[PDB]
Amino acid sequence: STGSATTTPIDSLDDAYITPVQIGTPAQTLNLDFDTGSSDLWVFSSETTASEVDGQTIYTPSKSTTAKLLSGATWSISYGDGSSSSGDVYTDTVSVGGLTVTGQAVESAKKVSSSFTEDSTIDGLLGLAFSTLNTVSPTQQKTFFDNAKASLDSPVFTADLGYHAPGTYNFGFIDTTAYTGSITYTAVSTKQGFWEWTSTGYAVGSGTFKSTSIDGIADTGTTLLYLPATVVSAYWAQVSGAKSSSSVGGYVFPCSATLPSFTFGVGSARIVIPGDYIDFGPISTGSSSCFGGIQSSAGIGINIFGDVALKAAFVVFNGATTPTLGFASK
């Protein structure tokens, strides 16, 4: 089997991407944030505290003839940005882009933190990291990809995120028309439950490439590119007037600037992030200070190749017995 679904930016900054997902019988379509940095499929629901729902579409398990309470199971998750959610668990039929999994754990939110309530465009998350990170207790549950893997033509999914435009998540096949050149594959460590790999270095603008190992995670659920402070300082030093602002919470730059590109290494290959992808716009409405899309990972404890980096590439999440990651230009 295969699936193919379009993923769409939630706003003009590409802060996140939503992909329609069919849950239950008859189908209830919710727009979920596909997150290769976590491993829970959770949704706003008829069980969510009413004051914490503000425009999201909800899953109502009582209206699904295939929903079944997973008795005794609860879940609770906290994300790197400080947000969180928790609730109970149903199993139900879940389809993405024509690919159907029966008996998928659908985690129904009873509580969500304010940032989820405040984002009316995201109806939940669909985790695509390794199932060892799934938070369901007392019986950990498998991700949608883990459940579908055996049925897929090939045990892979691909992320093709757009810059200010829709893109595609494919399951079970590699669309050879969606990228240029060849795909360079690189080793993955699953020891932390993430798609964790080691970049071979970086360049800033037209500068020379610096060979240096940068361990980090391919995380579609994180907006920005978080890298070591040395790397980030070298980047922003090329932008007149850029500075790290403790009050804003990272590097800012004059909105009048033209930003240089940023290149990262994948083995001997190179992925180029155009400068425009690094502009996240005014820090507050009408400000001439703009927020940077490359930020320091110091204090986060891990480097994160988030959407800023991934949307410059066609990315293969290879879930073979020994997982690997592939990157191609596009």
Side-chain angles (χ1 to χ4, degrees), residues 1-62 64-67 69-109 112-141 143-148 150-190 192-242 244-330:
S1 61
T2 63
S4 183
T6 299
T7 194
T8 301
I10 64 166
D11 63 22
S12 65
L13 296 177
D14 299 344
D15 281 316
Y17 297 78
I18 48 169
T19 308
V21 178
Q22 282 70 49
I23 308 177
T25 308
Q28 300 180 38
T29 298
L30 274 63
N31 295 328
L32 305 189
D33 184 353
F34 281 25
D35 179 15
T36 62
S38 68
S39 307
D40 288 49
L41 192 177
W42 74 261
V43 297
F44 279 79
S45 72
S46 57
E47 300 180 331
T48 309
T49 297
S51 63
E52 295 176 355
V53 184
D54 184 8
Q56 295 79 13
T57 294
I58 64 173
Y59 168 60
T60 303
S62 66
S64 173
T65 59
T66 41
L69 180 73
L70 185 62
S71 186
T74 59
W75 61 280
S76 178
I77 191 160
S78 309
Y79 296 102
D81 66 352
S83 67
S84 62
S85 53
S86 63
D88 56 18
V89 188
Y90 295 81
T91 57
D92 209 338
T93 300
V94 172
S95 301
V96 177
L99 169 67
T100 300
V101 167
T102 56
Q104 173 65 45
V106 176
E107 300 172 34
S108 166
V112 305
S113 67
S114 56
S115 61
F116 288 116
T117 300
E118 287 160 6
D119 183 2
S120 66
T121 72
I122 290 176
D123 302 324
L125 267 65
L126 190 149
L128 293 167
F130 293 88
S131 293
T132 54
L133 293 178
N134 175 267
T135 79
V136 176
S137 180
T139 307
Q140 187 171 59
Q141 300 294 303
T143 69
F144 174 84
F145 178 54
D146 215 336
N147 280 325
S151 303
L152 294 177
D153 291 356
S154 182
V156 305
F157 68 91
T158 65
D160 181 10
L161 303 179
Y163 167 68
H164 293 353
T168 304
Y169 281 103
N170 290 329
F171 290 85
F173 71 103
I174 285 162
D175 178 356
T176 60
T177 75
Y179 59 88
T180 65
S182 52
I183 305 179
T184 297
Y185 289 87
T186 196
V188 163
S189 171
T190 65
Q192 295 193 91
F194 299 122
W195 293 93
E196 187 170 359
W197 65 290
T198 302
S199 173
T200 49
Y202 69 100
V204 175
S206 60
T208 55
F209 186 84
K210 174 73 168 180
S211 295
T212 183
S213 293
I214 304 171
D215 182 286
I217 66 168
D219 185 0
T220 59
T222 289
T223 313
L224 306 186
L225 173 54
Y226 293 89
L227 291 174
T230 50
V231 179
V232 177
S233 183
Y235 178 81
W236 289 109
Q238 296 306 309
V239 179
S240 287
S244 183
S245 166
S246 55
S247 63
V248 174
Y251 279 89
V252 296
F253 67 94
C255 291
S256 60
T258 300
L259 296 177
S261 63
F262 184 89
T263 299
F264 63 96
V266 182
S268 55
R270 305 290 179 254
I271 299 294
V272 180
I273 305 170
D276 288 351
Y277 291 26
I278 299 161
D279 178 8
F280 280 74
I283 60 168
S284 297
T285 304
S287 179
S288 74
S289 184
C290 273
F291 197 67
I294 297 177
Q295 297 293 345
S296 178
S297 66
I300 305 181
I302 198 157
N303 302 304
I304 306 173
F305 294 87
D307 299 332
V308 163
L310 303 182
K311 72 191 179 183
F314 178 86
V315 188
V316 179
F317 294 81
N318 170 26
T321 306
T322 295
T324 63
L325 278 168
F327 292 81
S329 296
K330 67 184 183 190

